[PDB]
Design a protein around this nucleic acid. Sequence first.
RNA 1: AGGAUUGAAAGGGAAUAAGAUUAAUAGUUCUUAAUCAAGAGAAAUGGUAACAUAUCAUGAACUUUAAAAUGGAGUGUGAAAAUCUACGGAAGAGUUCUCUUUUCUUCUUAACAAAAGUAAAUUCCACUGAAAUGAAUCAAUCAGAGAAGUGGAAUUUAUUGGCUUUGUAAGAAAUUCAAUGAAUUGUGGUAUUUUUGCAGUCUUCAUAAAAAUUAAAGGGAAUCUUUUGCUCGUACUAAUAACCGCAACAGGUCUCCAAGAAGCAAAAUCUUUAGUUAAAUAGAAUAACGCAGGUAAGGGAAGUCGGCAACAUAGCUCUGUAAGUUAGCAAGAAAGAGUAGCUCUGGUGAUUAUCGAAUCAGAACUUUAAAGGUUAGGGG
Lengths: 73, 105, 87, 50
Amino acid sequence: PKQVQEFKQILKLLKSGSIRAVRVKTNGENTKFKVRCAKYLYTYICADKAKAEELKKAIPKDIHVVEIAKKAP
Amino acid sequence: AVRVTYVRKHSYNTKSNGIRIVKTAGGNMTVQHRQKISNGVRCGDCGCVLAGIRHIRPHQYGWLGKSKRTVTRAYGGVKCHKCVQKKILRAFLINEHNLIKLAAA
Amino acid sequence: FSCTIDLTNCTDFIEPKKLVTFFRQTIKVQGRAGNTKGIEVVTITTSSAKLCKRYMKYLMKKYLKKNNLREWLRVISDKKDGFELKF
Amino acid sequence: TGHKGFSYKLKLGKKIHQNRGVPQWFRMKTGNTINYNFKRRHWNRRKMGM
RNA sequence: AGGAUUGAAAGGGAAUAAGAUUAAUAGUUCUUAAUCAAGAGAAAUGGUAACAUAUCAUGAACUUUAAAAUGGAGUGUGAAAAUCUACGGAAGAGUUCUCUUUUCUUCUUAACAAAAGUAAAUUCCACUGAAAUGAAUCAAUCAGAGAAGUGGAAUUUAUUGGCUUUGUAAGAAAUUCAAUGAAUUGUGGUAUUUUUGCAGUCUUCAUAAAAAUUAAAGGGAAUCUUUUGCUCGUACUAAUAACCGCAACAGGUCUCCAAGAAGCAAAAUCUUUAGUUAAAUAGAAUAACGCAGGUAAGGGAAGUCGGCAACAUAGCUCUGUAAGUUAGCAAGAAAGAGUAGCUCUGGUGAUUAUCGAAUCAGAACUUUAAAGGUUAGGGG
């Protein structure tokens, strides 16, 4: 697994056509946007709610989105 | 304390059978296989360990980047900088002496 | 610091008034039982002195054994810095 | 042993297969004397030496 | 171009881990997350330098160098784990008419990668040029073929880059609670052991493997996605019942992991996790003669081939120690004294008033007067 640092790369990754799945996890302090690509599982630790919403709109509707919470699926 | 067992079927404390015991979720301890300690490179003349090149297994050098298996210099990776400096002076001073000694003295 | 004790299903077995005087007369704030002048007395709500939640369970279990009722009742933390009693 | 050659393992398997008794129906044949297999063996009684 | 076959399930070697699952298999299955090999879609900069740059930035024949690939001892030390411990807690359990802010349990994290923060050791580079000689280690050892100082570069430290931290990752797992759903998962130590590296020192009439395979150099010839990964082993015992001794034989048979007390000690003795209470039958009575373990008045080898057997000495500290001698030893010679419990006192540091280590010495008081439960030289 790899970790992306700032906001610019994740959108470029999201807009890239190499995506396969997206899973969003909400923790007691932050929100993680794990993007499942072909090779790696990129993740992004987000602590700003407004910036998280911007990310959620950036997700193409065709891809499958999994929401994870205190109870695992 | 938690006691462990060999995971592979080797049962002797050989050089290639080294292990490390690390902790794991639930308090259990698991067994890893650690790599052998390797030597680096040596100057072709003075036999000193070269700087700038890691001490890894021979095959792992191919995995490294092209710039990470050598030093950007003449005879880089096979001769130390001191080894190289003596080479240049020998090649220049002896040749210059040959022009004065012989070759229209 | 404010420990709260719930007896909502066992107050018939143990009247609160008997518990108030016991905690007042048994807490060893400095190794002395009964010198709990900084103790607000079922809640304890004391900040001047240093106590512990696990300390509160100690006397409560000690209290139950004194009255020979320990075999019937069990003190269980309610995950809200308090204790609730079950059967 | 845990480690064995392929051909050796198959020869082990046959010795397992041959360690069986006479089926009941064969014992009911007319003029039958073969009631028990005298070539039988057990691991703790006789070592098959292979 | 150079020499054929075979020879290691302990030598060399491309690449996988955590959790879960079965009546039984699992670095092999499942979930998740990775890695490796083979394929498919006039030719670069920076740094004074040591040297550095997500593939970059061409590099044939031929040749060389290095790695794979190298004894042992002993000392110091970095890091991890275990044990112990300091502060702060959360949950559960045990004791409780005598006390105990109490005693115990849980508080975890992989392969592979990332680079907030920050280490120890060694070797090099630049400036300068050391004598009134300095620098340093437990020990050493080093310097005008250049010390110390200041500023840098590199390598090693069980994967990337050593440790904390991060992704994986809390959604797992552990401990509780309710009847599937809920809670928590800090920070340290100038302590011991183990493991793994590193640094120098000592030692040899001992110098402590090779190839497959890989990279680099000298030379200048030429002009991210995706597929596949075949064959064979894989159950179980590994031994006071699965192996070899005719057997469920007190014999024999190579290895890995390794808690507390006490102690110099992996010793004897007791206990925790795990395992087991059966391992060629028992019950009653308590004769002789036995096998194994003991004691004994007074005397003390008078027994006997012979002190055979047993008794006796036994740790640590201090004092003291002969003849003889290859001058190294004898020597723990021989011989004598001290040692318990409790209440105290002082010495040995770190950091800059706070904190920390077992070690040594000394003093009052008390008693059943103290190595002796176990372990543990008889001497001349």
